[PDB]
Design an enzyme around this catalytic site. Structure first.
Site, PDB file in Angstrom:
ATOM      1  CD  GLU A  30      -2.892  -1.060   0.214  1.00 47.78           C
ATOM      2  OE1 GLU A  30      -2.884  -0.315  -0.530  1.00 47.78           O
ATOM      3  OE2 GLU A  30      -3.738  -1.982   0.336  1.00 47.78           O
ATOM      4  CE  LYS A  51       3.169   3.163  -7.269  1.00 49.01           C
ATOM      5  NZ  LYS A  51       4.591   4.031  -7.349  1.00 49.01           N
ATOM      6  CG  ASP A 141       7.601  10.387  -0.478  1.00 53.92           C
ATOM      7  OD1 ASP A 141       7.711  10.969   0.691  1.00 53.92           O
ATOM      8  OD2 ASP A 141       6.782   9.351  -0.530  1.00 53.92           O
ATOM      9  N   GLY A 161       6.622   8.116  -7.715  1.00 52.61           N
ATOM     10  CA  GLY A 161       5.152   8.588  -8.196  1.00 52.61           C
ATOM     11  C   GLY A 161       5.193  10.134  -7.737  1.00 52.61           C
TER      12      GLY A 161
END
Length: 290
Positions: A30, A51, A141, A161
């Site tokens: 997740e 994904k 990130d 992403g």
């Protein structure tokens, strides 16, 4: 409009339906929103990581484009290789390399990496961001969750992403993107940041490696962010367990003024990294060994 977004994405994905060449789906994740799965390429018997992201549930749906941006990249040996992307139902499917060693996070929160291993990991993450900052790519990130491993210790950056593109006509950005705890101070501050924020976050990640968790890890993600903006750079809970060298390397990273924060280019030679152990050093770290 949804359908216009879909159309636009249609233009960047490979066409068709991979559900036709894959089987043995195994859910295991997740992140972003939507699942990570694993499957077997029918033709070759080989393993991939699939994904799936629902286009209807996304904070900013057009961040979805970014994902697929790292097409054919580098192909860098420290970057997760992507093979294909498809649109399937109301979802985006990115089909990439399978990283059988799992994430770094499990390691960071179950063991105590020695500095040979810290070095190694930063070596491979830097060797990576350097190239990316070089061709304008921010990641945005960075965290132990975003780092991936092989049964033999090869370390690869992943989870692109959130990343961004920059040139000299369009260098900086303003968007609030990232995991609260790891965000560079200018970014909470909202300022025209650049690649340098990846450097900040890696410093938080070094803390992860050292202490097991990031700063202010218990505080509401909301208010911990203020702490990250006003505050003087954070305590290393176990500073006494770390060599001056490591803390000296870390000091180049966690500067409140971004102008002074080092670059990956700079950092790739800083003497600490002479410590970096071969991939085989990381192996006794992974769950199986333990």
């Amino acid at each position: 409009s949804h359908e216009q977004f879909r159309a636009a994405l249609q233009l960047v994905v490979d066409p068709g339906d991979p559900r036709s060449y894959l089987d043995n789906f195994i859910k295991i994740g997740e992140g972003s929103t939507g699942i990570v799965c694993i499957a077997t390429v029918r033709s070759s018997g080989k393993l991939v990581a699939v994904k799936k992201m629902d286009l209807r549930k996304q904070q900013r749906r057009e961040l979805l484009f970014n994902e697929v941006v790292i097409m054919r990249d580098y192909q860098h040996e420290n970057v997760v290789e992507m093979y294909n992307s498809y649109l399937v139902g109301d979802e985006l499917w990115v089909v990439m390399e399978f990283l059988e060693g799992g994430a770094l996070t499990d390691i960071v929160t179950h063991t105590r990496m020695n500095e040979e291993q810290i070095a190694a990991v930063c070596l491979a993450v830097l060797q990576a961001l350097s190239v990316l900052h070089a061709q304008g790519v921010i990641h945005r990130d960075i965290k132990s969750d975003s780092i991936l491993l092989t049964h033999d210790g090869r370390v690869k950056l992943s989870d692109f992403g959130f990343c961004a593109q920059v040139s000299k006509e369009v260098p900086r950005r303003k968007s609030l993107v990232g995991t609260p705890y790891w965000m560079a101070p200018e970014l909470i501050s909202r300022l025209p940041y650049g690649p340098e924020v990846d450097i900040w976050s890696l410093g938080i990640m070094v803390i992860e490696m050292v202490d097991g968790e990031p700063p202010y890890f218990n505080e509401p993600p909301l208010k911990a962010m203020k702490m990250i903006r006003d505050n003087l750079p954070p305590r290393l809970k176990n500073l006494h367990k770390v060599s001056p060298s490591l803390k000296g390397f870390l000091d180049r990273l966690l500067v409140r003024d971004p102008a002074q924060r080092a670059t990956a280019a700079e950092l790739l030679k800083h003497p600490f990294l002479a410590k970096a152990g071969p991939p085989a050093s990381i192996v006794p770290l992974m769950r199986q060994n333990r």
